[PDB]
Amino acid sequence: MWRIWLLFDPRRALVLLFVFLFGLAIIIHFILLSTSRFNWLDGPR
Amino acid sequence: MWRIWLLFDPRRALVLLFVFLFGLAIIIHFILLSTSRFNWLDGPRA
Amino acid sequence: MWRIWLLFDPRRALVLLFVFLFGLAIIIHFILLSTSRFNWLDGPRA
Amino acid sequence: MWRIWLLFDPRRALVLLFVFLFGLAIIIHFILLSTSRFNWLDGPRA
Amino acid sequence: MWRIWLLFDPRRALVLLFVFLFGLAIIIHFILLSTSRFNWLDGPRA
Amino acid sequence: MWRIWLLFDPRRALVLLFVFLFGLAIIIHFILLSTSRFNWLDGPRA
Amino acid sequence: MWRIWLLFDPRRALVLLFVFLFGLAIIIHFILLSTSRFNWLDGPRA
Amino acid sequence: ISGLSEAEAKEFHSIFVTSFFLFIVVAVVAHILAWMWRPWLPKATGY
Amino acid sequence: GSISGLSEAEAKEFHSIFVTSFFLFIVVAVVAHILAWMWRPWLPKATGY
Amino acid sequence: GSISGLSEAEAKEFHSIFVTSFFLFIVVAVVAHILAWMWRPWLPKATGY
Amino acid sequence: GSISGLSEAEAKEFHSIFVTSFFLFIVVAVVAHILAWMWRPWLPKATGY
Amino acid sequence: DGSISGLSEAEAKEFHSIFVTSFFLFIVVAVVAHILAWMWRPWLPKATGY
Amino acid sequence: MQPGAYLDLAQVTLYVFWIFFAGLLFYLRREDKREGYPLVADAGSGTRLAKIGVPAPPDPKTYLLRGGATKTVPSTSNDRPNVALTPAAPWPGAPFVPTGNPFADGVGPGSYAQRADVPELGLDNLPIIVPLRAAKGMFLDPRDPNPVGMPVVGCDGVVGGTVTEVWVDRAEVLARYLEVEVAKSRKRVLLPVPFALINDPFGKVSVDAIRGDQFAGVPTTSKGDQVSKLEEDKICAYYGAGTLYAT
Amino acid sequence: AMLSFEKKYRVRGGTLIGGDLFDFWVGPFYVGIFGVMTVFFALIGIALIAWNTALGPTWNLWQISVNPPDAKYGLGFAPLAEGGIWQWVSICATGAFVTWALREVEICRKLGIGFHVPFAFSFAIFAYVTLVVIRPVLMGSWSYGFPYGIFTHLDWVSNTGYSYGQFHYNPAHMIAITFFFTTCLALALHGGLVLSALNPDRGEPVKSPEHENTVFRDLVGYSIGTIGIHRLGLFLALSAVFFSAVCMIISGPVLAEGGSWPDWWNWWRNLPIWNP
Amino acid sequence: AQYQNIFTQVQVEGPAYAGVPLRPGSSPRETQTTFNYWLGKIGDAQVGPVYLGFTGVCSLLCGFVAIEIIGLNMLASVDWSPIEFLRQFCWLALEPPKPEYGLTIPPLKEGGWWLMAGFFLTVSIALWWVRTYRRSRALGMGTHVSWAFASAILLYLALGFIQPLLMGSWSEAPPFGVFPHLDWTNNFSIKYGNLYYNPFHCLSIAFLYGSALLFAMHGATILAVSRYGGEREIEQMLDRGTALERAALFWRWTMGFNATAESIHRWAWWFAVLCPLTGAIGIILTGPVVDNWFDWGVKHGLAPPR
Ligand SMILES: CCCCCCCCCCCCCCCCCC(=O)OC[C@H](COP(=O)([O-])OCC(O)COP(=O)([O-])OC[C@@H](COC(=O)CCCCCCCCCCCCCCCCC)OC(=O)CCCCCCCCCCCCCCCCC)OC(=O)CCCCCCCCCCCCCCCCC
Ligand code: BCL
Ligand code: BCL
Ligand SMILES: CC[C@H]1c2cc3[nH]c4c(c3C)C(=O)[C@H](C(=O)OC)c4c3nc(cc4[nH]c(cc(n2)[C@@H]1C)c(C(C)=O)c4C)[C@@H](C)[C@@H]3CCC(=O)OC/C=C(\C)CCC[C@@H](C)CCC[C@@H](C)CCCC(C)C
Ligand SMILES: COC1=C(OC)C(=O)C(C/C=C(/C)CC/C=C(\C)CC/C=C(\C)CC/C=C(\C)CC/C=C(\C)CC/C=C(\C)CC/C=C(/C)CC/C=C(\C)CC/C=C(\C)CCC=C(C)C)=C(C)C1=O
Ligand SMILES: CC(C)C/C=C/[C@@H](C)C/C=C/[C@@H](C)CCC[C@@H](C)CCCC[C@H](C)CCC[C@@H](C)CCC[C@@H](C)CCCC(C)(C)O
Ligand SMILES: CCCCCCCCCCCCO[C@@H]1O[C@H](CO)[C@@H](O[C@H]2O[C@H](CO)[C@@H](O)[C@H](O)[C@H]2O)[C@H](O)[C@H]1O
Ligand SMILES: [Fe+3]
């Protein structure tokens, strides 16, 4: 599996991975915040 | 079967495959969240 | 772990980190300020 | 901590700091002026 | 503190500072003239 | 304070000063005309 | 033998002077036309 | 690639680590105070 | 030389004049603010003036 | 040389002056905030002020 | 020629003709204004219509 | 050099003579037309109407 | 995503578009940096590390040419980084002043690039910029003025020479240059058509970029029937210098 | 701060006002005196918008709005709290646009190129001035300008449109829409053509302008050329804005505010060739 | 410096150009070719030759079948009078089917002719797309033009086919007429709330405005540096001259960033293609997903409840 780095530049791969991860995290957070059961700030209603 | 990679450079094919799989998974998850029976956050009564 | 600084320029990394952190902090503050419970200026009225 | 100036140019970091600080102060002052409790010119009802 | 003039040309720094100060003064005067309590021309709304 | 003409060039400082003063006079007159008490053309509004 | 036309070129001063003067005349005439007392075309708006 | 010597990389890493850790400590104290002001994470029926 | 292009002597001279002018500016501003407060105070109470 | 292009002596000199100015700024801001709290408190209770 | 493409004597001829034509335009405009004033005087009395 | 327009002095003077004659005939005909039009219905009413 | 919930399909689609558009902006700004990088640091800055900006320049790109050769961009050999200029002040952002003659040094508005010293070859390996006397089958559309014979005047009314030929572009039929014989020299220079007003005075060609007496200094061509790209760029820059330095 | 080839171009001279005092760069940006002026105007306008928003009910980005004065003020000056902020923001915006154009002129002079770009920006400045100055004056009051809001000036556009029957029947409006759509078509065509000539099929050399002429002579039977397409692009983009400005000038000042554009076209239906 | 490059001063005339020889697998071109003096004042003077093969001829035949159907229905709606046809030509149309027929094939006088004309026009447009792709491939060039055309085709299909499908009725489609289709546009906006509050409509308008802005900017820039040989955009990329250097430095000193001789055409391509794409998405969402855009805007804080 260590050969993937012979296929992709580690710098570009790492930057793209971090950007993808942050985007996914913030999107999941906002989806949870949009609901009513899992809204942790003002609560359910 | 390994001859497929004599036609397609593995890097481009792999990037395209990952984009395709991610998009498909996103679409399936959102379709499931759209319904009433398989909504796993708020539940039934849509 | 120190080897990550043989890959990326530390100047651009620090500028990116500072911009990202300031944007995140400003967004979290604005999100809290637009709620009723966590509005610390006018209070829980609205 | 003085080593931060072996990485960044002090002359331009100083101007960037001035701009950032002035912008932040202006934003905070307008936020205060927009509220009812902390409006120091005309007072509460707004 | 006199060393600040080894980094910045005094002419253009001075003219930029004067432009900044004039803009700030104009903004404050407009803000005060736009209120009701601190309007020094017509007076309070009533 | 004759030393100001060692840092600046009078032929350009005069142009800049005259343009700035004309603009400032325009601003002040426009602001005065905006009011009811200090309108010297129609006088006070009905 | 006034040195003013030795340090300051007349052909460039005259055009800018005329631009400013014509603009000011237009501004004043417009301001007078847009009023009820000093509108010389018809008069008051009754 | 970056253009940094190995010693410079190690020194930058040490200083970066200590700065990050102090920032984290300050943030944790801020969060303790913020929870003391108003707790989040309500119950399923509200606060 | 320096990034600015000045020497220590010129820098110190300009700094002295700059401090003097800044201080006269601050003095006039403080007098203006005292006069403006005597005209109308700001910072009301939680119920108004 | 160094990435910035400065030496250690210049870095330390600039850092001394910077730290001094930053600390004066911080002190003035702390006093401003104490006065502002004396004028209005913030952080209300869950039921208002 | 020159920047414009004219000599000095040519420029003086042009200027003489320009001036005399502009002067005739101005005098006939003045006559027109006198006539127009006799028809419908602007600047009327205290409240004119 | 030469003319900025390309016409020599003789051609210029001839064109100018013909132009002046044509303009003058146009002006004369216009003046007659305006006298007739005034005789039909005048303009420039008094401040209260016709 | 259920009916009545706050989340709905339209806003999900909108956020998908926002993410795609951020990606596209990054891709476009990445493509924008294939020429002129890394940057050249100003005065009073460190020169140990390169400045590239946050969208990093992409890897070099290779184009396949007609004959079988290749061309790798960025073209670093076209920059001319060492010219006769001196800084007008020691602080960053200060303009430069020419130390010598800007018409002959190639600085400022009279600056040219170090292009390849060969003519453009066209689709049959024959130069495309060609005098009309060497392009069999082309003529000048008699409905338009014939510049051949007209004198040329500078920005000061002085006559600098006369027009003897028109150089055309084959495969893109257009008049690109005029050949000018200088007044008292029997030598030939080129004048770009966009720099000339044919028939501005009825029988002349007006060039308001350089003075009439400066046509003697226009660079010349090696061969009398073809021009290289470097020579074209130099001839254009010479007339471009007059826009600021003709006085 | 300079590109790899930029140093030989950063020479002194080519200004209009100010001499060599403002003849420097700040990063990539040239400054001049008009740069200082335009940044000043922009910052005053932004601060005024922010102050007007603090006086309002919300900080929502989509709902911010600076409303023009009431119709009872005519073409005079309104109080700052009841319409004057709109007038001063309009003044500041006009100043910023004019100074931006003049800075572009200075940059053109320094580089030694033509003045086509500021001339083309003057058309957009003219359309803005027609919308906020000329038409409100011809109508009678500043209350006819549009609000400075992301979603409130769209409501202004729709109300103004429905004030004339159906605005689609405005003929200048039709010509302007045709020019806009043609501009989009031509931009797509030009971009795609240059890209396909520079990035050819797999295993091919880079193409030439003869291939570019051939492909459109094979598609539609005519090709305009490399200078012709840029001329045509400028022409179309400027004609669209010219005819939109004309479209707005004749609506209200010429056709009354209660009229209908569909009924104008009846001039064609009443021609004596077929009218009775 | 005083000559603006708007019009050609002197025109050069030679023999007609037959064209680059075609890759094997194509018919021969035509030979008729002429020159026009006025077209040469702004651009190129040669007109022709044209290439017609199978796809172009079939495209023209289907398009003329559709045009003939539309015109014969317009003549029948006016009792075949040519005088009354010319009197009101912009007010005539071929209306879409009636809402009571769903997606079936309606009677001829109630939607059948409309459906047949739509079918043949769609086949014509698809054949023209195939022709663009084929003509581009026959010269060894890329296919960017056909993939830009596909976006306009997609907006056309969304307007006429996809949205009626998802709504379950042919009546949701526009008529074939000059003024009637403008009336259809107005009524479509009125029927589904206010189309100003559709965010993809807003994005499409932004991209149309940006397309005009960018094409004006690019035209003005290329005309300004054409004195240094700037109009040869392909040779200026393989060998950078001073024209493109000045062009890039203008925009760098103006607004901070610039492009290359090629990337600006990518900006162009993308801003032109993104208008019909966002438009098609917004049209597909209108009706099937959202039926009142102002209520959507109120729900997401675009406007006060009003
Ligand atoms: C949920 C939220 C999530 C997060 C959201 C946000 C996420 C992040 C988004 C980021 C987007 C990209 C931005 C760039 C990030 C990466 C930067 C990088 O890699 O290097 C910098 C990089 C340059 O790299 P380089 O050329 O190699 O130079 C390397 C060195 O920096 C050269 O070094 P140098 O020395 O030559 O120059 C130095 C100079 C460099 O200056 C600059 O580069 C200026 C510009 C900076 C970047 C600005 C970025 C702005 C981002 C805006 C984001 C959008 C805002 C939208 C707002 C909307 C409002 C409605 O200054 C500094 O760097 C100073 C740094 C050090 C400061 C020290 C202060 C004191 C410390 C010590 C304290 C005391 C301690 C001791 C105490 C005592 C102990 C005893 O910058 C750029 O490329 C600039 C252009 C980037 C694009 C700009 C436009 C983007 C679109 C903006 C739209 C909005 C409008 C405009 C903004 C409006 C704002 C209100
Ligand atoms: C119900 C409403 C009516 C209607 C009512 C109106 C009204 C009212 C108007 C239009 C106008 C237009 N309509 Mg209409 N219109 C309708 C339907 C349409 C349809 C359609 C498909 O149905 C189309 C394509 C159009 C198209 C058009 C254009 C002809 C025109 C907009 C272009 C323009 O004004 O440029 C002008 C461009 C500008 C003014 C841009 C100004 C640029 C400035 C100088 C720069 C600003 C910079 C900024 C401040 C700073 C940014 C810096 C940041 C850092 C980036 N309308 C409907 C039927 N329409 C407008 C018009 O023609 O005005 C001239 C107009 O007023
Ligand atoms: C009152 C009316 C509504 C309105 C109703 C609509 C409706 C409905 C639509 C738009 C659409 C658009 N509107 Mg609108 N729009 C309004 C106000 C505006 C204003 C404004 C200033 O007020 C502007 C600038 C616009 C502009 C726009 C564009 C962004 C967009 C059109 C894209 C396009 O290029 O299609 C033109 C291109 C095509 C239609 C594709 C071309 C198809 C093929 C390529 C052509 C083949 C021709 C064929 C061969 C010729 C022979 C055929 C036979 C002769 C028959 N609208 C108001 C609010 N608008 C469209 C959109 O996509 O938005 C979501 C759309 O459907
Ligand atoms: C990026 C989106 C924009 C766009 C792009 C675009 N349009 C395109 C293309 C592209 C990239 C083409 O390649 C294609 C084309 O051929 O352009 C020259 C085309 C095209 N866009 C056209 C029209 C068009 N585009 C429009 C819009 C837009 N097109 C968008 C704004 C509109 C509008 C606003 O309504 C119209 C009316 C055509 C000129 C052409 C597609 C021609 C076609 O499909 O023909 C079908 C044939 C018939 C209907 C038969 C009847 C004959 C004619 C009435 C049709 C036109 C024929 C003529 C163009 C060529 C004839 C040559 C002869 C020698 C045979
Ligand atoms: C009563 O009513 C009628 C009208 O009066 C109201 C009319 O006025 C007319 C019209 C006639 C006139 C009076 C005008 C004069 C015109 C003519 C004289 C021409 C006569 C025309 C006809 C009689 C019929 C014309 C039909 C044609 C030209 C072909 C039609 C083909 C199809 C409809 C395709 C079938 C549908 C399919 C397959 C759907 C697939 C989807 C697509 C959109 C893609 C289609 C693509 C292809 C099939 C081709 C692909 C080709 C490729 C890839 C290229 C391959 C490589 C090659 C080079 C071959 C008629 C006929 C009519 O009756
Ligand atoms: C059962 C399935 C299988 C079939 C369906 C297959 C689907 C795929 C069909 C889908 C069709 C959709 C997609 C198309 C929708 C169309 C809209 C998008 C656009 C409408 C067009 C708007 C124009 C303004 C029309 C004007 C035309 C008219 C003015 C010209 C008339 C010509 C006359 C004068 C002919 C000259 C006079 C004489 C008599 C000689 O001829
Ligand atoms: C490039 C073009 C390629 C083809 C693109 C389009 C392909 C078709 C898309 C997939 C089809 C989805 O399937 C489609 O679903 C819609 C939405 O419920 C149904 O449409 C439905 O609309 C509503 C309910 O929502 C009812 O009033 C209607 O009677 C019913 O038909 C269609 O009857 C069915 O055909
Ligand atoms: Fe181009």
The DSSP secondary structure of J1-49, one letter per residue, reads --SSS--HHHHHHHHHHHHHHHHHHHHHHHHHHHHHHHH---S-BTTB-
CA proximity to N207, closest of O235, O19, O222 = O235
Breaks in chain C after residues (C–N exceeding 2.5 Å):
none
Counting the structural domains of chain M, the total is: 2
Nearest to L4 among K5, K39, K40 (CB): K5
Is the peptide bond prior to M38 cis by the omega test (within 30 degrees of 0)?
Answer: yes
Residue of chain J whose Cα is closest to the Cα of I43:
J39
C-alpha–C-alpha distance, residues M19 and A26, integer Å: 12
* DSSP string covering N94-142: HHHHHHHHHHHHHHHHHHT--SHHHHHHHHHHHHHHIIIIIHHHHHTSG
Co-location of O51 and O102 in the same domain: yes
Tell me which of N113, N122, N146, N162 to substitute to probe the interface with O (most O C-beta atoms closer than 10 Å). Answer: N113
Ligand 4 midpoint to CA O213 (Å):
22
Residue whose structure tokens are 């044509």: L22
Neighbours of M170 (CB within 10 A): 22
Neighbours of M61 (CB within 10 A): 12
CA proximity to M219, closest of M112, M90, M144, M146 = M112
Which chain N residues are Cβ-neighbours of O213 within 8 angstroms? 237
Beta carbons of N25 and M125 less than 8 angstroms apart: no
Angle between helices O242-255 and M229-245 (to 10 degrees): 50
Neighbours of C5 (CB within 10 A): 20
Is the peptide bond prior to M74 cis by the omega test (within 30 degrees of 0)?
Answer: yes
- Record the resolution, in angstroms: 2.8
C-alpha–C-alpha distance, residues O22 and O51, integer Å: 11
Q: Which residue CA neighbors atom 31 of ligand 7 most closely?
A: O168
C-alpha–C-alpha distance, residues M185 and M216, integer Å: 8
Joined together, the tokens standing for residue M198 give 């044919």
C-alpha–C-alpha distance, residues N153 and N145, integer Å: 9
Residue whose structure tokens are 């403006």: I36
Q: Which residue CA neighbors atom 37 of ligand 6 most closely?
A: O71
Joined together, the tokens standing for residue O69 give 């159907």
Ligand 3 midpoint to CA O120 (Å):
22
Beta carbons of N183 and N233 less than 8 angstroms apart: yes
Q: Judging by beta carbons within 10 Å of its beta carbon (0-12, 13-18, 19+), is residue M213 exposed, middle or buried?
A: middle
Helices vs. strands in chain F: H and E counts, helices first? 2, 0
Domain boundaries, chain J: 1-49
SS3 N20: coil
Ligand 5 midpoint to CA O160 (Å):
19
Q: Where are the alpha helices (DSSP H) in N130-225?
A: 135-139, 152-162, 171-198, 209-219
Say what the alpha-carbon torsion angle N261, N264, N269, N275 is, to the nearest 10 degrees: 140
Co-location of O158 and O134 in the same domain: no
* Phi, psi for M70 (deg, rounded to 5): -130, 165
Q: Where are the alpha helices (DSSP H) in D1-46?
A: 10-34
Say what the alpha-carbon torsion angle M98, M103, M104, M110 is, to the nearest 10 degrees: 80
* Method used to obtain the model: cryo-EM
C-alpha–C-alpha distance, residues I4 and E8, integer Å: 5
Contact D30 N51 (CB under 8 A): yes
Query: Residue M219 gets which letter from DSSP?
Result: -
Beta carbons of O136 and O142 less than 8 angstroms apart: yes
CA proximity to N165, closest of N253, N246, N251 = N251
Which chain N residues are Cβ-neighbours of D46 within 8 angstroms? 55
CA proximity to N225, closest of N214, N238, N236 = N214
* DSSP string covering N82-106: GTHHHHHHHHHHHHHHHHHHHHHHH
Domain boundaries, chain N: 1-163, 164-265
C-alpha–C-alpha distance, residues O269 and O277, integer Å: 13
Q: Which residues contact M232 (CB under 8 A, 6 or more apart)?
A: M115, M129, O229, O241
Chains that touch O (3 or more CB pairs under 8 A): M, N
Reduce the secondary structure of M110-140 to three states and give it as a string. Answer: HCCCCCCCCCCCHHHCCCCEEEHHHCCCCEC
C-alpha–C-alpha distance, residues G9 and N17, integer Å: 13
Q: Judging by beta carbons within 10 Å of its beta carbon (0-12, 13-18, 19+), is residue M95 exposed, middle or buried?
A: buried
Joined together, the tokens standing for residue N191 give 């971009």
CA proximity to M49, closest of M39, M60, M62 = M39
Beta carbons of N76 and F33 less than 8 angstroms apart: yes
Whether O162 is in the pocket of ligand 7, judged by its Cβ within 6 Å, is yes
Beta carbons of E7 and D11 less than 8 angstroms apart: yes
Contact I11 E5 (CB under 8 A): yes
User: Ligand 4, closest atom to CA O50?
Assistant: 64
Beta carbons of O51 and O29 less than 8 angstroms apart: yes
Q: Judging by beta carbons within 10 Å of its beta carbon (0-12, 13-18, 19+), is residue N19 exposed, middle or buried?
A: middle
Q: Is I1 on the interface with M (CB under 8 A)?
A: yes
Contact O179 N169 (CB under 8 A): yes
Joined together, the tokens standing for residue O26 give 């194509």
CA proximity to N99, closest of N17, N23, N24, N28 = N17
C-alpha–C-alpha distance, residues M205 and M7, integer Å: 70
Cα angle at L8 between L5 and L12, to 5 degrees? 80
User: Ligand 5, closest atom to CA O125?
Assistant: 43
C-alpha–C-alpha distance, residues N158 and N153, integer Å: 9
Which chain G residues are Cβ-neighbours of K42 within 8 angstroms? 40-41
E strand or H helix at O47: strand O46-47
Counting the structural domains of chain O, the total is: 2
Residue M128 structural domain: 115-247
C-alpha–C-alpha distance, residues J12 and D3, integer Å: 8
Is the peptide bond prior to M151 cis by the omega test (within 30 degrees of 0)?
Answer: no
**What's the distance, Cα to Cα, between the start and end of chain C in Å?**
48
User: Ligand 1, closest atom to CA N61?
Assistant: 60
Q: Where are the alpha helices (DSSP H) in chain O?
A: 39-42, 54-76, 82-87, 112-137, 144-157, 163-167, 178-191, 199-224, 235-238, 242-255, 263-285, 293-299
Beta carbons of O215 and N235 less than 8 angstroms apart: no
Q: Where are the beta strands (DSSP E) in chain A?
A: none
Whether O284 is in the pocket of ligand 7, judged by its Cβ within 6 Å, is no
What's the sign of the alpha-carbon dihedral M207, M210, M214, M220?
negative
Contact C10 H12 (CB under 8 A): yes
* DSSP string covering B11-43: HHHHHHHHHHHHHHHHHHHHHHHHSSSS-SSS-
Chain centroid, CA L2 distance in Å: 31
User: Ligand 3, closest atom to CA O128?
Assistant: 49
E strand or H helix at A18: helix A10-34
Beta carbons of O45 and O35 less than 8 angstroms apart: yes
Neighbours of C18 (CB within 10 A): 11
* Phi, psi for M167 (deg, rounded to 5): -90, 125
CA proximity to N175, closest of N247, N125, N230, N121 = N247
Q: Judging by beta carbons within 10 Å of its beta carbon (0-12, 13-18, 19+), is residue H41 exposed, middle or buried?
A: exposed
How do strand M129-131 and strand M151-153 relate by DSSP bridges? unpaired
Contact E8 I2 (CB under 8 A): no
Beta carbons of N66 and N82 less than 8 angstroms apart: no
Q: Is K8 on the interface with M (CB under 8 A)?
A: no
Q: Which residues contact N261 (CB under 8 A, 6 or more apart)?
A: N164, N165, N166, N167, N168, N169, N170, N255
Angle between helices O199-224 and O263-285 (to 10 degrees): 160
The percent helix, strand, coil of chain C (3-state, each to 5) is 65, 0, 35
Whether O193 is in the pocket of ligand 6, judged by its Cβ within 6 Å, is no
Cα angle at B15 between B14 and B19, to 5 degrees? 115
Neighbours of M105 (CB within 10 A): 17
SS3 A14: helix
| Backbone φ/ψ region at K7: left (φ over 0), alpha (ψ -120 to 50), beta | beta
Ligand 7 midpoint to CA O167 (Å):
7
C-alpha–C-alpha distance, residues N48 and N32, integer Å: 25
Ligand 8 midpoint to CA O133 (Å):
21
C-alpha–C-alpha distance, residues M183 and B14, integer Å: 69
Which chain I residues are Cβ-neighbours of D44 within 8 angstroms? 44, 46-48
Joined together, the tokens standing for residue D22 give 């002035």
Angle between helices O199-224 and M9-31 (to 10 degrees): 20
Co-location of M228 and M142 in the same domain: yes
How do strand N25-26 and strand N29-30 relate by DSSP bridges? antiparallel
CA proximity to A15, closest of C27, B14, C12 = C12
Beta carbons of M96 and N10 less than 8 angstroms apart: yes
Co-location of M87 and M128 in the same domain: no
Q: Which of M114, M134, M154 is the last residue of a domain?
A: M114
Nearest to D8 among C11, C42, C43 (CB): C11
- Determine the length of chain I: 49
Q: Which residues contact D23 (CB under 8 A, 6 or more apart)?
A: none
Ligand 4 midpoint to CA O72 (Å):
23
CA proximity to O254, closest of N103, M92, M147, L1 = N103
What's the sign of the alpha-carbon dihedral N156, N160, N165, N166?
negative
* DSSP string covering N223-271: ---HHHHHHHHHHHHHHHHHHHHHHHHHBTTTB-TT--STTTTHHHHT-
Joined together, the tokens standing for residue N118 give 């500021």
Say what the alpha-carbon torsion angle H21, H24, H30, H36 is, to the nearest 10 degrees: -110
Q: Which ligand is nearest to the CA of N221?
A: 4
Contact: chain E with chain I (3+ CB pairs below 8 Å): yes
* DSSP string covering E1-46: -GGGGGTS-HHHHHHHHHHHHHHHHHHHHHHHHHSSSS-SSS----
Name the minimum distance, in Å, from the CA of I14 to any CA of chain E: 8
Q: Is E27 on the interface with N (CB under 8 A)?
A: yes
The one-letter code for the residue type at C7 is L
Beta carbons of A18 and A24 less than 8 angstroms apart: no
C-alpha–C-alpha distance, residues N21 and M26, integer Å: 37
E strand or H helix at M177: strand M174-182
Q: Is O61 on the interface with N (CB under 8 A)?
A: no
Beta carbons of N124 and N240 less than 8 angstroms apart: no
Q: Which ligand is nearest to the CA of O55?
A: 5
Query: Residue M75 gets which letter from DSSP?
Result: -
